[PDB]
Amino acid sequence: AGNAARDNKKTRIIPRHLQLAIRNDEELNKLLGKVTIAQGGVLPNIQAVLLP
Amino acid sequence: RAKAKTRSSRAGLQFPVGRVHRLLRKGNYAERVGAGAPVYLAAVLEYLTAEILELAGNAARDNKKTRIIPRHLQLAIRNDEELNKLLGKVTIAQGGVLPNIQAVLLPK
Amino acid sequence: PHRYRPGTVALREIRRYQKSTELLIRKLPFQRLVREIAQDFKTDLRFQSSAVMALQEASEAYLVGLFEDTNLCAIHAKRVTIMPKDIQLARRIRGER
Amino acid sequence: YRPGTVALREIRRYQKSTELLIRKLPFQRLVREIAQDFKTDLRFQSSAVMALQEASEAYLVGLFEDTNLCAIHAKRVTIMPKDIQLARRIRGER
Amino acid sequence: DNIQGITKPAIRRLARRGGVKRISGLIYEETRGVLKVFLENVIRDAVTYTEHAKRKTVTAMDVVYALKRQGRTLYGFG
Amino acid sequence: DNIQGITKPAIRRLARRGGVKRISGLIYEETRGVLKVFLENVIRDAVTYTEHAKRKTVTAMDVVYALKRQGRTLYGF
Amino acid sequence: MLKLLKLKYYTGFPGKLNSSQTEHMVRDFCYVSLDYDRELAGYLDWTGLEDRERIVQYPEEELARIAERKKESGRRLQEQAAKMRLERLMKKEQELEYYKDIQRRMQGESKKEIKRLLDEAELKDEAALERVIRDLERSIKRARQQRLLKSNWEARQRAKAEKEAEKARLAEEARLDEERRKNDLEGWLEEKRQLRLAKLNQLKERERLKADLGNRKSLASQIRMKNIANLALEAAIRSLENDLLRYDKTFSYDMTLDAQRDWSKSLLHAFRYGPRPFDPSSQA
Amino acid sequence: KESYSVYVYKVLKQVHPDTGISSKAMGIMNSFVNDIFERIAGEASRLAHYNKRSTITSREIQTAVRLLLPGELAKHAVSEGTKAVTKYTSS
DNA sequence: TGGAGAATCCCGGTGCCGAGGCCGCTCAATTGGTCGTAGACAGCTCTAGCACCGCTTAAACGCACGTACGCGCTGTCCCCCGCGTTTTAACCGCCAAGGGGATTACTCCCTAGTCTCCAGGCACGTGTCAGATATATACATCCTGTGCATGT
DNA sequence: TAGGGAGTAATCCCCTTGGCGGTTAAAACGCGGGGGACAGCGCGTACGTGCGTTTAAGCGGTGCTAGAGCTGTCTACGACCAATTGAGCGGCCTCGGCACCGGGATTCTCCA
């Protein structure tokens, strides 16, 4: 989450950073697969066939 | 000592209120367990048993058999909306599946 | 004169709303709906401000996850348009249906 | 019987029986082949292998149902690797 | 009515967040139905916990317990 | 290489029980992969309980516990 | 008194029900009846409830545009429905032509070639083909560019001719019915009473099936399970009642299904609210 | 080695008197009993710990049953349990 | 290869509200003993799992053929999409009101704990009988391979 | 038979119910209008069907001992208990990260 905050040029961990931290690690995402995080948002992901 | 009246009876039950009480108490559900709790839980366990076994015997008669087996239990547990919701993520050994073939696959 | 082609602004949005954390359903419609339901279970309930927000977060999280699964079903059937069909197969494979 | 009918007969045959569909000794050898990756020289109760088999067959059968709906949604009557992967995808097993 | 407060634009945004490019007009009413069923299930449990606790107010904890009961654990409250 | 002991006929029968009319030939190797992943998950947990119990033998209960842990309760043992 | 006003107004009363205001209700609205068991049983009758009951208070252009939008949305739905109806009729005509063609090809062919043509058309026998043609003809009867336009125009003319023929048939039946009425009426009334009873029984059987569908023990689910285990009107009643009201002096509005289904019948509205009609959710 | 066999048998011979049940089916039914027991008891324990109580009364068992069992199932279960506890109290 | 102009990003100044922090203080966390039994350990029995060996024959597997299904390609135009637009009501900011969740104090009967008993239930035999396996005692009957005759 | 958890009354406060008024973002609309859905059609290939040979599944025996399960001992670790104190809870402090806004610099569309 600290890495995620740094990448977004901020010093404070906000909920978004915990979501990015959890979803980008396979082992955290398997541990917390059924968990919803308030104000977390979603990973940027557009399916291949939708792009022009 | 006065004669030992089993609590199942004191209750009008076939199920063992006594054993249920042991399991709740010795089973760490909480520090203290009332008498009411054993009675009620035993009753609820009896009711669901009754429903399942009834539907199963209905199935067994439908197939002209005297003996309830696993397949029968399974077909019973799947033909009732409520039991199938209670046991929707349970597998029954030697139960098999309910007969189902999609329409698009049927002869046209 | 100028017109972005159908599909362009859609991708702009898919980028915008996948980058933001905000709740997408307006709050008051949502609060009214939450209550409107609750009074069928017990009359004259009160709701903590945080309780309605927890329901909203869970509801939006449920629907968005459902739509991901729905989208994959549409794509499997060689569509880009989701329909009742897609939503329902999604809900079924998941287990809800 | 006209083509495709024998398939529906076979489906009916397999849906009315309760027998196990994988051969016992092949499945037992698969269980032991997997087990020795986790700990060597494991012993198994006879009943433990049968419990694994019943669970495994029940899992695969349920997966094939979901797979079938994926195929039919795509306007196909043939199941394909894609259909399995979507089923596994939406179940959250991925 | 109140369910129609979940507007066509609101549902569009949620579909967009999920990566959906094109949305059939029938999706909006299906989504409302699906949402209503989900909320009913969670609120039923939340009210059940509320009643048990002898309270008249539904708390954040009652909702969190209702969600955890249904396998949809929510972090950020409680 | 015991995985191919799960025969094409065995997989076919299971697909029949699951209501499948026609089977593309690539299904057999996917089904083996899927089954192996599932068995690994159950057996790893079963062995974990077995080791904890200080046993060398995997018991029926260890499998039933492993299945319940994974939301696939198995009645009958 | 507080408990009975709390349980009478059952669905929730928007008002603070104090104990003292119920006490002041008791002080000026209660009296001990002389003969209780006779006064009580005929108390909630409709005739005279207005004097027994004691009541207590508590403290064009935009309509034309909404009506036009509903008319326009209604017109579009009708247009879509009309299109779907026409499309279905065209499909049935194409199917009828296909089976008639198979019927023509079967005229003068060997028994082996007739079986091949019937197998290609997924039909078991020549009798099954005639049944399908009869059903399609009955259904249709009830219901390059210039070639396409001529085909669509002829299909519409056939559909119009079928509809006109059906309308003519119904008109003739109506005339004959009117002519028969200019004659016997009794036998006509007995038939209408029997028809009414038959339809009521059908409604009751359906209500029973509907109630049983929310139930299980019913033998209905057991017969279904046994079958699976072995394998493993209101408009018509209103029309008849309207006819009986117009021509039958012995048939009163009270004997109508609508009358057997109205507030003036139930006592619970007289118990909660009174002989006046329902609350429209107003202020006072 | 304790099992709810006995009781499953008494209930069976009460509801379908001439019908038996197989050994495998008895196993499955006993597993059913154990599972439902566990679920209800556990939900009850959670409700207790959540309300800072340290006792599982009749009222905990009731609310557990209402959370766990669906619709008519829940209603009928509540009914039976209440009836039983009432008879017990009376005796 | 090339524009209009829209969506987008980066910089910089402002300021606000909450991120990072400090003072009391109290009650929980540690210290330091006591004790008694839960579980670790050692020894022993015998259940069942493993290992192997020979045989039978159900199924698997390999092959050949064909067909119907998957899949590519074409053409038509639906009902959902889209704009600027007009309308609407959330939102925001502020304020009054007071419900019922939370605290304290007390009081009392609920269930735990204890010593005691015996009977309900569990393991184990046993025995028996409903439906099933062949059949002596006889004979008529149904079956259909196959041969002969008749017709085309 | 013991003793303390919980049911209950006196008490109140904080956060929820609730209203009001102004602004503007957003929601919904009067009218055009299209590209990707779908239906049709053709073709080729891969799957189904069947036929024959090979191959180990499955039965059933024999044997052996590994190891699961029991049984008896005993100790060391945890529950408890009382005294002591310092780490953490409330809430007050204060200053800096972020939100915001505007403004300017840039990448990008899509169609000429």
Residue numbers in the entry:
A (entry chain O): 66 to 117
B (entry chain S): 11 to 118
C (entry chain Q): 38 to 134
D (entry chain M): 41 to 134
E (entry chain R): 24 to 101
F (entry chain N): 24 to 100
G (entry chain J): 242 to 300, 311 to 394, 429 to 517, 574 to 625
H (entry chain T): 34 to 124
Q: What is written in the article reporting this PDB entry?
A:
INO80 is a >1-megadalton chromatin remodeler that is conserved from yeast to human and emerges as a central multisubunit enzyme complex that determines chromatin structure around NDRs/NFRs. The Ino80 polypeptide itself carries the core ATPase motor activity and acts as a scaffold for the three modules. The A-module is highly conserved in evolution and contains an HSA (helicase-SANT–associated) domain (Ino80HSA) in the middle of the Ino80p polypeptide chain, along with actin (Act1), Arp4, Arp8, Ies4, and Taf14. The INO80 remodeler specifically places nucleosomes at the boundary of gene regulatory elements, which is proposed to be the result of an ATP-dependent nucleosome sliding activity that is regulated by extranucleosomal DNA features.
The C-module is the core nucleosome sliding unit: It contains the Swi2/Snf2 ATPase motor domain of Ino80p (Ino80motor), the scaffolding AAA+ ATPases Rvb1 and Rvb2, and nucleosome binding subunits Ies2 (Ino eighty subunit 2), Ies6, and Arp5 (actin-related protein 5). The NCP is bound by Ino80motor-Ies2 at DNA superhelical location SHL-6 and by Arp5-Ies6 at DNA SHL-2. Furthermore, the Arp5 “grappler” insertion domain interacts with the nucleosome “acidic patch,” a motif at the H2A/H2B interface that is a binding site for numerous chromatin proteins. The improved maps and AlphaFold2 structure predictions allowed us to model the complete Arp5 protein, in particular its unique grappler insertion element. We consistently observe two major configurations in the helical insertion domain of Arp5 denoted grappler, which might point to rather complex functional roles in sliding or exchange reactions. In the “parallel” state, its two main helical arms are arranged in a near-parallel fashion and bind DNA around the nucleosome dyad. In the “cross” configuration, one helical arm binds along the DNA gyre, placing its tip at the entry DNA opposite the motor domain. Using 3D variability analysis, formation of contacts between the tip of the cross arm appears to coincide with a better-defined HSA/post-HSA and a properly curved entry DNA, suggesting a functional link.
